[PDB]
Design an enzyme around this catalytic site. Sequence first.
Site, mmCIF file in Angstrom:
data_model
loop_
_atom_site.group_PDB
_atom_site.id
_atom_site.type_symbol
_atom_site.label_atom_id
_atom_site.label_comp_id
_atom_site.label_asym_id
_atom_site.label_seq_id
_atom_site.Cartn_x
_atom_site.Cartn_y
_atom_site.Cartn_z
ATOM 1 N N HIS A 106 11.804 -96.811 -133.588
ATOM 2 C CA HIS A 106 12.688 -96.887 -134.734
ATOM 3 C C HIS A 106 14.023 -97.542 -134.399
ATOM 4 O O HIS A 106 14.650 -98.116 -135.287
ATOM 5 C CB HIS A 106 12.869 -95.514 -135.364
ATOM 6 C CG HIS A 106 11.641 -95.035 -136.069
ATOM 7 N ND1 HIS A 106 11.629 -94.737 -137.409
ATOM 8 C CD2 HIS A 106 10.371 -94.855 -135.637
ATOM 9 C CE1 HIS A 106 10.410 -94.392 -137.778
ATOM 10 N NE2 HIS A 106 9.625 -94.457 -136.724
ATOM 11 N N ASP A 107 14.459 -97.475 -133.148
ATOM 12 C CA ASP A 107 15.608 -98.279 -132.745
ATOM 13 C C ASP A 107 15.236 -99.749 -132.610
ATOM 14 O O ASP A 107 15.895 -100.643 -133.164
ATOM 15 C CB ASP A 107 16.214 -97.767 -131.451
ATOM 16 C CG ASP A 107 17.556 -98.433 -131.141
ATOM 17 O OD1 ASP A 107 18.245 -98.873 -132.093
ATOM 18 O OD2 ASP A 107 17.921 -98.503 -129.962
ATOM 19 N N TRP A 159 -2.069 -102.026 -129.114
ATOM 20 C CA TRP A 159 -1.655 -101.487 -127.821
ATOM 21 C C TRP A 159 -0.496 -100.517 -127.970
ATOM 22 O O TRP A 159 -0.471 -99.479 -127.307
ATOM 23 C CB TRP A 159 -1.272 -102.620 -126.871
ATOM 24 C CG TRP A 159 -2.388 -103.607 -126.614
ATOM 25 C CD1 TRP A 159 -3.710 -103.417 -126.812
ATOM 26 C CD2 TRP A 159 -2.236 -104.953 -126.145
ATOM 27 N NE1 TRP A 159 -4.404 -104.553 -126.471
ATOM 28 C CE2 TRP A 159 -3.522 -105.515 -126.069
ATOM 29 C CE3 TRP A 159 -1.135 -105.731 -125.783
ATOM 30 C CZ2 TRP A 159 -3.735 -106.828 -125.656
ATOM 31 C CZ3 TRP A 159 -1.349 -107.020 -125.364
ATOM 32 C CH2 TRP A 159 -2.640 -107.557 -125.293
ATOM 33 N N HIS A 205 0.434 -93.019 -130.459
ATOM 34 C CA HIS A 205 -0.041 -91.983 -131.354
ATOM 35 C C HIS A 205 -1.011 -91.033 -130.666
ATOM 36 O O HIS A 205 -1.378 -90.001 -131.250
ATOM 37 C CB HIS A 205 -0.631 -92.607 -132.612
ATOM 38 C CG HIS A 205 0.437 -93.078 -133.567
ATOM 39 N ND1 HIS A 205 0.175 -93.451 -134.872
ATOM 40 C CD2 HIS A 205 1.774 -93.237 -133.407
ATOM 41 C CE1 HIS A 205 1.310 -93.795 -135.465
ATOM 42 N NE2 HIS A 205 2.300 -93.689 -134.593
ATOM 43 N N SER A 206 -1.357 -91.310 -129.409
ATOM 44 C CA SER A 206 -2.100 -90.368 -128.583
ATOM 45 C C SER A 206 -1.258 -89.181 -128.129
ATOM 46 O O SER A 206 -1.814 -88.188 -127.681
ATOM 47 C CB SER A 206 -2.649 -91.100 -127.362
ATOM 48 O OG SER A 206 -3.548 -90.271 -126.643
ATOM 49 N N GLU A 249 7.456 -81.676 -127.703
ATOM 50 C CA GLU A 249 7.994 -82.198 -128.937
ATOM 51 C C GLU A 249 9.064 -83.250 -128.705
ATOM 52 O O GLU A 249 9.052 -84.302 -129.341
ATOM 53 C CB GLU A 249 8.557 -81.052 -129.771
ATOM 54 C CG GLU A 249 9.141 -81.528 -131.070
ATOM 55 C CD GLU A 249 9.045 -80.512 -132.157
ATOM 56 O OE1 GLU A 249 8.905 -79.307 -131.834
ATOM 57 O OE2 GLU A 249 9.086 -80.932 -133.340
ATOM 58 N N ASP A 298 -4.113 -86.832 -132.608
ATOM 59 C CA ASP A 298 -5.370 -86.692 -131.885
ATOM 60 C C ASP A 298 -5.509 -85.276 -131.369
ATOM 61 O O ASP A 298 -4.607 -84.443 -131.533
ATOM 62 C CB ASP A 298 -5.649 -87.814 -130.842
ATOM 63 C CG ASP A 298 -4.923 -87.686 -129.492
ATOM 64 O OD1 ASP A 298 -4.255 -86.671 -129.199
ATOM 65 O OD2 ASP A 298 -5.094 -88.648 -128.705
ATOM 66 N N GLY A 328 17.834 -105.018 -132.702
ATOM 67 C CA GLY A 328 16.750 -104.555 -131.859
ATOM 68 C C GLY A 328 17.069 -103.288 -131.102
ATOM 69 O O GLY A 328 17.570 -102.326 -131.665
ATOM 70 N N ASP A 346 19.154 -101.560 -129.383
ATOM 71 C CA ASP A 346 20.602 -101.670 -129.221
ATOM 72 C C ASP A 346 21.325 -100.359 -129.436
ATOM 73 O O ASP A 346 22.548 -100.345 -129.434
ATOM 74 C CB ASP A 346 21.150 -102.727 -130.182
ATOM 75 C CG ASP A 346 20.947 -102.373 -131.647
ATOM 76 O OD1 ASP A 346 20.223 -101.408 -131.987
ATOM 77 O OD2 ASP A 346 21.513 -103.092 -132.489
#
Length: 315
Positions: free
Chosen positions: A47-48, A164, A169-170, A36, A187, A60, A62
């Site tokens: 998200h950063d 790419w 998400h794998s 997890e 998946d 960016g 940072d």
Amino acid sequence: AKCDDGRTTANAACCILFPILDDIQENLFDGAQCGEEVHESLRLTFHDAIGFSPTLGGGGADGSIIAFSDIETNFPANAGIDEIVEAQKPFVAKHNISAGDFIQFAGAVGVSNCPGGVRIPFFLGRPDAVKASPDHLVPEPFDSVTSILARMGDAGFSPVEVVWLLASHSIAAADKVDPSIPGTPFDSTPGVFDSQFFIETLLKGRLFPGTADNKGEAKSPLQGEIRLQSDELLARDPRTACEWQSMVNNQPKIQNRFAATMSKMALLGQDKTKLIDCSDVIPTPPARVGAAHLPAGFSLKDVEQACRKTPFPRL
Ligand code: HEM
Ligand SMILES: [Ca+2]
Ligand SMILES: [Ca+2]
């Protein structure tokens, strides 16, 4: 340079990373698992970093999502991210490393725990965050392909690079898309960095794994798998479908392109020439990965043939 480890690293500054590696493997990644916290830490890298636009602002990669956590974690697109943000803070506090560096280091180390994973280049030296990211820079799963490609493009990524990067998400699940079934993966192999995500998102939907009509959720082919609307659409859209299909059963490409594009992402808002290459600290991932396949019970008729140039391959 030689560290007190005995280990040789390309640049002396990198020796500081070994104690950090040991601590996070035990205490963040739960005995060096691809579990997890790895998944959450990898999501955090994005998200950063994606809070970067030449015109709209944002610094960016940072550490802003940690430094300005009360601001950023309350952005709707950052739902559920606070847990990993708060879990990372005590490691940043004790390890003499910027938040921005830590986020990228943790992401790279975590991916390396996953069978089939790839070593992502890692650079040390990002300064502390200067300002919070603006809101509205993180793609959401109910955004159109046009919107996602425009936002990712604004940050610097081509449509093929978006595909790419979605290899992530794998090794990934959702807690907030359908809150009745937290931890449902994208998946059939959330502990293995492999092509199953690209295959399984192309299967024709049959059911919902939890409730129906969740915003940003599409029909899934399998109980115990959740599908994002964005992934459903990207797999099928003329702008991305052929690249999506090209990943299926091409493990080496998935690895090579993910590493290269993650490095680009980890450097948004930064200048590699002002940082220190510490890539040699990232462990080699477990190499064993099986052949790509359709899930049990499925056949070629269950695959949506979205790419027109090339048929879906025989697995
Ligand atoms: C391109 C647009 C993208 C969209 C719309 C998107 C959307 C999402 C959503 C909705 C979730 C589930 C959050 C939840 O409900 O718990 C998720 C999870 C995740 N995302 Fe993506 N994502 C995108 C790109 C990326 C990229 C580029 C990365 C690369 C690091 C990434 C890595 C992950 C990971 C690893 C998770 C799993 C987190 C966990 O299991 O704890 N995503 N994403
Ligand atoms: Ca940021
Ligand atoms: Ca997988």
